[PDB]
Amino acid sequence: EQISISSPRKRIYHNILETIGGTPLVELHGVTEHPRIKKGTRILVKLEYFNPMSSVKDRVGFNIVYQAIKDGRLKPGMEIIESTSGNTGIALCQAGAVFGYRVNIAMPSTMSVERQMIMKAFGAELILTEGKKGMPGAIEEVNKMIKENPGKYFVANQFGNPDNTAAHHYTANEIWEDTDGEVDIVVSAVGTSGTVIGVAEKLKEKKKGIKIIAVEPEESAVLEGKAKGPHGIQGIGAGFIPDIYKKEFVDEIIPIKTQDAWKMARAVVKYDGIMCGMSSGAAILAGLKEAEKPENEGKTIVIIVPSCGERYLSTDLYKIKDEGTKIQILDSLLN
Amino acid sequence: EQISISSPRKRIYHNILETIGGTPLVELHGVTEHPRIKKGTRILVKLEYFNPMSSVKDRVGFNIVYQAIKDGRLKPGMEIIESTSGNTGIALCQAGAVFGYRVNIAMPSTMSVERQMIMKAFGAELILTEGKKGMPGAIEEVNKMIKENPGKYFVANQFGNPDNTAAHHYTANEIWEDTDGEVDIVVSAVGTSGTVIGVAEKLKEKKKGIKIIAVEPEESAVLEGKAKGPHGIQGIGAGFIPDIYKKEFVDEIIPIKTQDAWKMARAVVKYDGIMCGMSSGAAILAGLKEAEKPENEGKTIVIIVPSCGERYLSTDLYKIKDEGTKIQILDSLLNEHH
Ligand SMILES: *Cc1c(COP(=O)(O)O)cnc(C)c1O
Numbered sequence: 018e019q020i021s022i023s024s025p026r027k028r029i030y031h032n033i034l035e036t037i038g039g040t041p042l043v044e045l046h047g048v049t050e051h052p053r054i055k056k057g058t059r060i061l062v063k064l065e066y067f068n069p070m071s072s073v074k075d076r077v078g079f080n081i082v083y084q085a086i087k088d089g090r091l092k093p094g095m096e097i098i099e100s101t102s103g104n105t106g107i108a109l110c111q112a113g114a115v116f117g118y119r120v121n122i123a124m125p126s127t128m129s130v131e132r133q134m135i136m137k138a139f140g141a142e143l144i145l146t147e148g149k150k151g152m153p154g155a156i157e158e159v160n161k162m163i164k165e166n167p168g169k170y171f172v173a174n175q176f177g178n179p180d181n182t183a184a185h186h187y188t189a190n191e192i193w194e195d196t197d198g199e200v201d202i203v204v205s206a207v208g209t210s211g212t213v214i215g216v217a218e219k220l221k222e223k224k225k226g227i228k229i230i231a232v233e234p235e236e237s238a239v240l241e242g243k244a245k246g247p248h249g250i251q252g253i254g255a256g257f258i259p260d261i262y263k264k265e266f267v268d269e270i271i272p273i274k275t276q277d278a279w280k281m282a283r284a285v286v287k288y289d290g291i292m293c294g295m296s297s298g299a300a301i302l303a304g305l306k307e308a309e310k311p312e313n314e315g316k317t318i319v320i321i322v323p324s325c326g327e328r329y330l331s332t333d334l335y336k337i338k339d340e341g342t343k344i345q346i347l348d349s350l351l352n
Numbered sequence: 353e354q355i356s357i358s359s360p361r362k363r364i365y366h367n368i369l370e371t372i373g374g375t376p377l378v379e380l381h382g383v384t385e386h387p388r389i390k391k392g393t394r395i396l397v398k399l400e401y402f403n404p405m406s407s408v409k410d411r412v413g414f415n416i417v418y419q420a421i422k423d424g425r426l427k428p429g430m431e432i433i434e435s436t437s438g439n440t441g442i443a444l445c446q447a448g449a450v451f452g453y454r455v456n457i458a459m460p461s462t463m464s465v466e467r468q469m470i471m472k473a474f475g476a477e478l479i480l481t482e483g484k485k486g487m488p489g490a491i492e493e494v495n496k497m498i499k500e501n502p503g504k505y506f507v508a509n510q511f512g513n514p515d516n517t518a519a520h521h522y523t524a525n526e527i528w529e530d531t532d533g534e535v536d537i538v539v540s541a542v543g544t545s546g547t548v549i550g551v552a553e554k555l556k557e558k559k560k561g562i563k564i565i566a567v568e569p570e571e572s573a574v575l576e577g578k579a580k581g582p583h584g585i586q587g588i589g590a591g592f593i594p595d596i597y598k599k600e601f602v603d604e605i606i607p608i609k610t611q612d613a614w615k616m617a618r619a620v621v622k623y624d625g626i627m628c629g630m631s632s633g634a635a636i637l638a639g640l641k642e643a644e645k646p647e648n649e650g651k652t653i654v655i656i657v658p659s660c661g662e663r664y665l666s667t668d669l670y671k672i673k674d675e676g677t678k679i680q681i682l683d684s685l686l687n688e689h690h
């Protein structure tokens with residue numbers, strides 16, 4: 018067979034923010050080579066690290082800040098300020114630099130040492146919190162900071178800001194377009210849940226039969242009624258239900274163990290040559306568990322890949338190695 | 353003024369390899385705001401970190417393996433090898449993974465330890481040579497391996513492989529289409545020279561008068577006949593003139609100093625929100641200087657941005673915090689004369 022690379026975009030972008038979105042939808046083949054996965058069943062991954070700062074959050078940082086400005090909620094003199102688990106902080110720095118607004122961030126030193134190492138360069142100004150802080154380290158921090166410093170700050174409030182969810186109607190349109198309306202199932206690991214709900218509401222609008230599946234850490238299955246627990250899937254498992262979350266739009270929630278998520282992440286880069294992050298591992302494994310169900314035969318399954326594994330080198334993601342063959346590794350992951 | 357994000361690609365890719373190329377051409381603004389740069393001249397950057405592994409090398413690693421598999425130089429039973437500790441090794445690992453070929457990358461033990469990890473992630477067999485030996489030590493190991501194992505390896509040979517250069521006819525094609533034939537000048541920091549020449553070859557077929565400019569470390573201006581020397585602009589300044597290099601296609605060569613390249617890279621991310629790498633900082637500076645030249649008013653200048661600054665967090669790229677207002681920094685970057 019022949020392999021054709023991408024053609025010219027035929028567009029000259031005015032600024033980096035215009036290169037956000039329109040991320041590639043790619044077929045998985047290596048990790049899908051399994052007896053119970055029919056050839057008619059298509060498993061596609063939507064690579065969000067193709068965004069300017071390699072994360073799905075690029076859509077969110079841009080939208081939150083952009084709307085706030087056109088709204089009047091953010092105006093000359095004020096400053097953006099948020100508390101995040103990583104990529105959101107980065108996307109806000111990217112938007113701030115372009116719009117000319119100084120950014121302020123507060124995150125838990127426990128996520129990924131290199132996310133902390135990106136905000137400075139952009140012109141940001143940090144503060145970081147305790148691990149096991151989960152959010153009281155991210156969230157509250159800014160709360161107090163703003164408090165006495167009145168109408169000077171604009172808080173992103175990613176977990177409750179509707180402009181987060183809204184940015185994903187584009188993610189949804191992209192999925193619908195790229196599959197020419199064949200998308201049957203969409204799988205998404207949840208952080209703020211802006212992606213899962215934003216996509217769900219926009220796709221349901223185009224076709225109600227689509228099944229929306231949320232993915233969360235088994236060690237902190239909060240969407241499934243459990244309590245905040247410790248886990249290693251960076252980017253998700255906030256430890257509480259986001260205000261922007263709407264269960265009515267989610268059909269099934271799948272819990273994934275931190276380790277299986279890492280292991281899946283390893284198989285995906287090894288057998289498909291796609292270097293996805295930790296949360297992507299959880300999303301893909303859950304997507305593969307759907308692909309083997311008898312009633313999903315022939316269906317088209319789209320899985321969001323939030324980030325790239327390179328932003329996790331400092332972690333244990335690629336530390337331990339896996340024994341056995343591919344089919345061997347795939348079996349341990351599915352059963 | 354309205355800001356519109358990208359539209360759906362309206363396409364499903366058979367594999368990651370197919371998402372290579374077709375990189376974005378973006379207008380620079382913040383760093384072009386200096387009295388000596390005219391309002392007409394257009395300064396654009398081609399972001400090659402939009403490739404699947406964030407570097408211009410994805411095009412090269414792909415084409416080398418693809419062309420070899422097509423010609424029969426690479427076949428079942430063989431393995432890929434290459435002494436490289438940069439982006440090319442990563443590029444080859446990605447191709448090998450998809451095409452199903454074992455990859456072997458040789459590099460000094462002591463350096464770039466998780467780029468190493470990135471490579472091991474793809475399942476690459478790392479060949480760590482003696483630290484104080486450097487790249488020459490790794491190349492010696494490669495030569496030793498292929499010599500003791502005749503017919504077993506396929507050497508990428510990025511500095512002398514015509515398939516490197518050929519890959520950039522696409523890069524060229526993209527610049528031509530994206531600028532609707534308007535491109536006047538192309539600036540490219542040189543590593544293997546695959547980019548500057550592959551683009552020049554194709555573009556000089558499109559129209560007469562397209563200026564091709566190569567950029568290199570001012571501390572190792574080998575293309576300019578100077579002597580090899582120590583510099584800090586990763587990705588370029590190989591220290592010798594690559595076999596695929598063809599002086600005929602290059603109109604001008606601009607030497608850029610290491611810290612200047614770094615200083616530009618910071619200004620670009622800070623004032624344009626584009627986190628480019630070291631070599632990108634060098635090319636952009638070079639490109640900006642061309643933009644202040646009287647004869648270049650109203651022209652369209654295209655600058656290649658080889659990689660993302662995220663792959664340089666362990667270096668001193670962002671360690672130094674520049675003092676001064678934006679104008680002070682830009683003015684300090686463009687104050688050299690004649
Ligand atoms: C932010 C982030 C997510 C977010 O999922 P959402 O539903 O959009 O909040 C997922 N994965 C990673 C790695 C992230 O950084």
Ligand SMILES: *Cc1c(COP(=O)(O)O)cnc(C)c1O
Binds near residue numbers: 541658
């Ligand atoms: C590979 C690479 C280059 C290459 O320049 P070429 O003329 O194409 O060899 C430049 N910069 C960086 C960072 C690279 O990795």
